[PDB]
Design a protein around this ligand. Structure first.
Ligand SMILES: *[C@@H]1O[C@H](CO)[C@@H](O[C@@H]2O[C@H](CO)[C@@H](O[C@@H]3O[C@H](CO)[C@@H](O)[C@H](O)[C@H]3NC(C)=O)[C@H](O)[C@H]2NC(C)=O)[C@H](O)[C@H]1NC(C)=O
Ligand SMILES: *[C@@H]1O[C@H](CO)[C@@H](O[C@@H]2O[C@H](CO)[C@@H](O[C@@H]3O[C@H](CO)[C@@H](O)[C@H](O)[C@H]3NC(C)=O)[C@H](O)[C@H]2NC(C)=O)[C@H](O)[C@H]1NC(C)=O
Ligand SMILES: *[C@@H]1O[C@H](CO)[C@@H](O[C@@H]2O[C@H](CO)[C@@H](O[C@@H]3O[C@H](CO)[C@@H](O)[C@H](O)[C@H]3NC(C)=O)[C@H](O)[C@H]2NC(C)=O)[C@H](O)[C@H]1NC(C)=O
Ligand SMILES: *[C@@H]1O[C@H](CO)[C@@H](O[C@@H]2O[C@H](CO)[C@@H](O)[C@H](O)[C@H]2NC(C)=O)[C@H](O)[C@H]1NC(C)=O
Ligand SMILES: *[C@@H]1O[C@H](CO)[C@@H](O[C@@H]2O[C@H](CO)[C@@H](O)[C@H](O)[C@H]2NC(C)=O)[C@H](O)[C@H]1NC(C)=O
Ligand SMILES: *[C@@H]1O[C@H](CO)[C@@H](O[C@@H]2O[C@H](CO)[C@@H](O)[C@H](O)[C@H]2NC(C)=O)[C@H](O)[C@H]1NC(C)=O
Ligand SMILES: *[C@@H]1O[C@H](CO)[C@@H](O[C@@H]2O[C@H](CO)[C@@H](O)[C@H](O)[C@H]2NC(C)=O)[C@H](O)[C@H]1NC(C)=O
Ligand SMILES: *[C@@H]1O[C@H](CO)[C@@H](O[C@@H]2O[C@H](CO)[C@@H](O)[C@H](O)[C@H]2NC(C)=O)[C@H](O)[C@H]1NC(C)=O
Ligand SMILES: *[C@@H]1O[C@H](CO)[C@@H](O[C@@H]2O[C@H](CO)[C@@H](O)[C@H](O)[C@H]2NC(C)=O)[C@H](O)[C@H]1NC(C)=O
Ligand SMILES: CC(C)C[C@H](NC(=O)[C@@H](O)[C@H](N)Cc1ccccc1)C(=O)O
Ligand SMILES: *[C@@H]1O[C@H](CO)[C@@H](O)[C@H](O)[C@H]1NC(C)=O
Ligand SMILES: *[C@@H]1O[C@H](CO)[C@@H](O)[C@H](O)[C@H]1NC(C)=O
Ligand SMILES: [Zn+2]
Length: 902
């Protein structure tokens, strides 16, 4: 039998009740340049089963407790055993307290410790954040516990089901502000040993998980609103940022989103206030800490003057996401990280609902399809994918836990929950969801608990009927990886399902308890009229007249792509669909217009339709005003561009794309009053951004003209940028393309003086669009200079250049030549050799190019490849695929484009 301090999961012998935790960061270094924080904690816990050892999480903390590493006391009149010895076991991250006797079932104990650790800038635990205000470097203190870093700030039972109440005290310079999950008890008070310091006590938290704790000490200020129930809402940011009003949009949306979720969930927001704080260079993105949610600045702040509409959308959706957790994930918490998908899938879905409430004219719910469904299907249509569910006994180590945080868990999770909601109807879903939340408030659950509660709601009504239990249907979507392609022969109304894989020649080696069969809910539209809902059972083949058609008829499946599957037809129904789109497109719902494109290209990739059938599905676009179907096309074709932009196929492609996009370009020229006012709603704003982008980048002269006109106008008046943030990336890029060192230098200047991150990113990317070799080689020379380009931007700037077809060879040489900079960039800052390699080898589609790549790998002789070690293997295997795809496709593709370019 093995020793419990060597097992990654905690015993169940001791459960915490409550914690006192006092943290004191020292924001001035110790002259050796070390910053530290000091702590003291007391954890009260209960004995469940007899035991003569206390195992508790601890990570990179030194103890300065008097005596042993902890002091142990009994609560009330409980006696307590003497401590034998206390040790730290680093591998499993434990403080282990061996006792001279056993604790007693039903007895409560208090364990006190004093400790300190590094206040590193590592974005982990209690950690520091350095940033610039004027001539001053500022340092603040803040936390990121997710997922196994609470133990890095204070010793605790750091598993998510092991909830307790937390009383937090912060000791801090007296002119700084102290924040935590809960409001402060009253006014800060001076620290008696040194009144330069203050003491802020916070109210007791609700029963909660250690990973949701947060405490922050900074100079930050806030904008406030008291919602009507009394809930204080603040937005915290850098003083300068607050003073520019960049916190306003977040303040505008937060109250609304909160009220929405409180109703949607049928459950009060469980806290007295909600803080949201914008942190500079928070690489985690955002973190749903209960009552104190942290965001990277670009994610929470918004400047109306410079930010685009897609920035606004990012702000509102990110808030909606984190706010969604305040109930789902925080109030009711998954018992273990194997069910992460539930929590994050759920928030990934309801973010759309929350944001839609705040911005009801935008139609945000639509964006889940391009943004999550098709995104995740690209990786879920692979042999190397994995189930939503993972057995709990296979997730044990911090790194195994971190692996749970991926595209499957977020995006498929959102996609399957969205499907669940649609086949139940939202009202029914909400009923079960309210029931789950009430039954499990302040406790922990598994996905089976949600199913059980949704089943309860189903069982209590008569309108919605199901082929099977919620569980049994959901098990097909959660226990096995992948999804089905649904093929229909409209001639007969026969309908099949198979495990879909983009590579038709791939060996699936992961077995399923269901033989890759799903219970599939299928909506469907015939002649623009909604048909009866159908359910495909767990069978390969079936028939229903719902999918039988006539000569003049067409049938389309999966309305609004609510189902997690792709649809293929017979050629005739396909052609008929096409005719409808040529003649009256408004009869096919705008999401399915997109679906036709999305699925067809994937099916072509899988060899289930010819590539010409997919291309035919773009033909209708010349009359399409709407964002999504265009976006589907632009997404599906970016790879054709990447393969053919250096070949005889390109000219035809561009000619074609010009043809398709011009009418749309014209339409906006009209509708925007010669580009003087943006369209009204989000979707139309996106469509315009896409058309202009496409028009210019395929060389539509009217687009080129505009781009040159506006940039001329800007250079004549630098302080008054005429270009609307929405169009900056296109206009900037095209203009620099049409220009020389005049345009490039101006832009570069603008970059060096640009205050706001997004504007800098747009100039940095545009600068890569010069068509001059000397200008792109000069600019590469700049990427390895920190005074000119931030290290954290270098590999990205290199990829932008390689994106330019003129820049492809220049970038590829730069990289091979400077590969002697793995041993300069591996110690100071990661650098991400993985991203750089993948981006620069992206185009490689020929035998010759492959020999070059092999020949480059022959520098194997040390220097290695670092964090891109075997991201070079992926690049070799990706070129082989490209060569093989280009041989099979070149001819057919070329002919089609010529055929259709007028
Ligand atoms: C976790 O933190 C709690 C808050 O600090 C502790 O509870 C506090 O204990 C204090 C003393 O230990 C009490 O303050 C005063 O102390 C003087 C001693 O000189 C006493 O006479 C008074 O009873 C008391 N003052 C008043 C106005 O009653 C606090 O009463 C008390 N604060 C509370 C309960 O909110 C917990 O003890 C601490 N937990 C553990 C396990 O140590
Ligand atoms: C928690 O305890 C750790 C172990 O006590 C501390 O880590 C130790 O830090 C020492 C200095 O910071 C290192 O020793 C040497 O220190 C002298 C004088 O400061 C230097 O000249 C030497 O360069 C240095 N030795 C070397 C080989 O570089 C210890 O090596 C080091 N031990 C480790 C890292 O295991 C932590 O400082 C302490 N942390 C906190 C936050 O209190
Ligand atoms: C947070 O919510 C506020 C309340 O809805 C928004 O305030 C509105 O901002 C609009 C756009 O900035 C203003 O519209 C126009 O602004 C121009 C430019 O100054 C004026 O000339 C026009 O008179 C005005 N009205 C028009 C075109 O009809 C609104 O006036 C203003 N509304 C209120 C009640 O103040 C905030 O914009 C919003 N903040 C953010 C960052 O989105
Ligand atoms: C954290 O603070 C809370 C709030 O005061 C403490 O809650 C009290 O716990 C004591 C000791 O069990 C009880 O006598 C009181 O009934 C509780 N008060 C309230 C208002 O709930 C809690 O004990 C503190 N935690 C720790 C570790 O001391
Ligand atoms: C809070 O107090 C500290 C200590 O005085 C201030 O820190 C100094 O700020 C000045 C700028 O006015 C700098 O020139 C110094 O280098 C800082 N000193 C140290 C030791 O860090 C700080 O500015 C004050 N902050 C607020 C918000 O009032
Ligand atoms: C949760 O939902 C219930 C049921 O919808 C809410 O109670 C209803 O509120 C309306 C208010 O006009 C009444 O007319 C209904 O008859 C109520 N139903 C019941 C069963 O009481 C309830 O208020 C919601 N709670 C929260 C916290 O949002
Ligand atoms: C994790 O969650 C379960 C519930 O899913 C908790 O078990 C419940 O505990 C409460 C209060 O102690 C009781 O009312 C119920 O009888 C329990 N339900 C069960 C066992 O199904 C459990 O305590 C939580 N685990 C931890 C470690 O807090
Ligand atoms: C549609 O499905 C039906 C049956 O589910 C298929 O028809 C059968 O095909 C077998 C194969 O040899 C024949 O022996 C049977 O006599 C047929 N059954 C009938 C007509 O009831 C039919 O081929 C399918 N259509 C397709 C795939 O297009
Ligand atoms: C498919 O999705 C569209 C959105 O693209 C749905 O249309 C929306 O429906 C709601 C309620 O009817 C309205 O409040 C929105 O304003 C509608 N928008 C548009 C553009 O019509 C449509 O109802 C969905 N159809 C089905 C069958 O689910
Ligand atoms: C809208 C979301 C996808 C935003 C997202 N944030 C989250 O998922 C949070 O709710 C996560 N729970 C926090 C997190 C993120 C990354 C790594 C570790 C921990 C992120 O930007 O990473
Ligand atoms: C997979 O197995 C098949 C035969 O079942 C074989 O022809 C093929 O080479 C294998 N691998 C790949 C990657 O196609
Ligand atoms: C085409 O279909 C739309 C959408 O239903 C309908 O409103 C319109 O009357 C039709 N227009 C034409 C020109 O046939
Ligand atoms: Zn999340």
């Amino acid at each position: 039998q093995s020793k419990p301090w060597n097992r990654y999961r905690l015993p169940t012998t001791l459960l915490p009740d409550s914690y006192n935790v006092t943290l004191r960061p020292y924001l001035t270094p110790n002259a050796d340049g070390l910053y530290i924080f000091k702590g003291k904690s007391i954890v009260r816990f209960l004995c469940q089963e007899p035991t003569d050892v206390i195992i508790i999480h601890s990570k990179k903390l030194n103890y300065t407790t008097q005596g042993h590493m902890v002091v142990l006391r009994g609560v009330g009149d409980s006696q307590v055993p003497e401590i034998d010895r206390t040790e730290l076991v680093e591998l499993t991250e434990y403080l282990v307290v061996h006792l001279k006797g056993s604790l007693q079932p039903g007895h409560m104990y208090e364990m006190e410790s004093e400790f300190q650790g590094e206040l590193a800038d590592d974005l982990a635990g209690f950690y520091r954040s350095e940033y610039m205000e004027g001539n001053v470097k500022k340092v603040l203190a803040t936390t990121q516990m997710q997922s196994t870093d609470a133990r890095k700030s204070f010793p605790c039972f750091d598993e998510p089901a092991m909830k307790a109440t937390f009383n937090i005290t912060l000791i801090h310079p007296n002119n700084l502000t102290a924040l935590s999950n809960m409001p402060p008890k009253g006014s800060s008070t001076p620290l008696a040993e040194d009144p330069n310091w203050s003491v802020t006590e916070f109210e007791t938290t609700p029963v909660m998980s250690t990973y949701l704790l947060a405490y922050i000490v900074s100079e930050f200020q806030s904008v406030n609103e008291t919602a009507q129930n009394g809930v204080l809402i603040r937005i915290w940011a850098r003083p300068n940022a607050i003073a520019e009003g960049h916190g306003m949009y977040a303040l505008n949306v937060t109250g609304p989103i909160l009220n929405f979720f409180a109703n949607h969930y049928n459950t009060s927001y469980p806290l007295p206030k909600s803080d949201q704080i914008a942190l500079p260079d928070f690489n985690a993105g955002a973190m749903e800490n209960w009552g104190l949610v942290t965001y990277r600045e670009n994610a929470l702040l918004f400047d109306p003057q410079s930010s685009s509409i897609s920035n606004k959308e990012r702000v509102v959706t990110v808030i909606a996401h984190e706010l969604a957790h305040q109930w789902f994930g925080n109030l009711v918490t998954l018992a273990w990280w194997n069910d992460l998908w539930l929590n994050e899938g759920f928030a990934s879905y309801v973010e759309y609902l929350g944001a839609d409430h705040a911005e009801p004219t935008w139609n945000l719910k639509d964006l889940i399809v391009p943004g999550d469904v098709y995104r995740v299907m690209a990786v879920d249509a692979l042999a190397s994918s994995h189930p939503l569910t993972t057995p709990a006994e296979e997730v044990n180590t911090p790194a195994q836990i971190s692996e749970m945080f991926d595209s499957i868990s977020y995006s498929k999770g959102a996609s399957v929950i969205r499907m669940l909601s649609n086949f139940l109807t939202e009202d029914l879903f909400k009923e079960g969801l309210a029931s789950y939340l009430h039954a499990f408030a302040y406790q922990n659950t598994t996905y089976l608990d949600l199913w059980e509660h949704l089943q309860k709601a189903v069982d209590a009504q008569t309108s919605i009927r199901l082929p099977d239990t919620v569980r049994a249907i959901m098990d097909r979507w959660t226990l096995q990886m992948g999804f089905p392609v649904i093929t229909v022969d409209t001639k007969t109304g026969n309908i099949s399902q198979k495990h879909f894989l983009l590579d038709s020649e791939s060996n699936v080696t992961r077995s399923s308890a269901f033989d890759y069969l799903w219970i599939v809910p299928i909506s469907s539209i015939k002649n623009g009229v909604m048909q009866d809902h159908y359910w495909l059972r767990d069978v390969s083949q079936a028939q229903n007249d719902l999918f039988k058609t006539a000569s003049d008829d067409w049938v389309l499946l999966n309305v609004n792509v609510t189902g997690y599957f792709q649809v293929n037809y017979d050629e005739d129904n396909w052609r008929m669909i096409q005719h409808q789109l040529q003649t009256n497109l408004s009869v096919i719902p705008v999401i399915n217009r997109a679906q036709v494109i999305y699925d067809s290209f994937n099916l072509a990739t899988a060899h289930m339709v010819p590539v010409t059938l997919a291309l035919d599905n773009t033909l209708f676009l010349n009359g399409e005003k709407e964002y999504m179907p265009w976006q589907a096309a632009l997404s599906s074709l970016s790879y054709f561009s990447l393969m053919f932009d250096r070949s005889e196929v390109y000219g035809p492609m561009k000619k074609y794309l010009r043809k398709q996009v011009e009418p749309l370009f014209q339409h906006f020229e009209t509708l925007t009053k010669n580009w003087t006012e943006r369209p009204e709603n989000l979707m139309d704003q996106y469509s315009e951004i896409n058309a202009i982008s496409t028009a210019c980048s395929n060389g539509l002269p009217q687009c080129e003209n505009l781009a040159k006109t506006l940039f001329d106008q800007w250079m004549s008046d630098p302080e008054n940028n005429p270009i609307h943030p929405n169009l900056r990336s296109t206009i900037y890029c095209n203009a620099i393309a049409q220009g020389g060192q005049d345009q490039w230098d101006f832009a570069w200047g603008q970059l060096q003086q640009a205050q706001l991150v997004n504007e800098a990113d747009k100039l940095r990317s545009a600068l890569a669009c010069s068509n001059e070799v000397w200008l792109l080689n000069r600019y590469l020379g700049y990427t390895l200079n920190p005074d000119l380009i931030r290290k954290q931007d270098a590999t990205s700037t290199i990829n932008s250049i390689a994106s330019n077809v003129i820049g492809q060879p220049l970038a590829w040489d730069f990289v091979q030549s400077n590969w002697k900079k793995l041993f300069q960039d591996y110690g100071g800052g990661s650098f991400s050799f993985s991203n750089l390699i993948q981006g620069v080898t992206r185009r490689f589609s020929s035998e010759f190019e492959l020999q070059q790549l092999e020949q480059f790998k022959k520098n194997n002789m040390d220097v290695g490849f670092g964090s891109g070690t075997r991201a070079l293997e992926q690049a070799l295997e990706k070129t082989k695929a490209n060569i093989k795809w280009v041989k099979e496709n070149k001819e057919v593709v070329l002919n089609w484009f010529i055929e259709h370019s007028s």
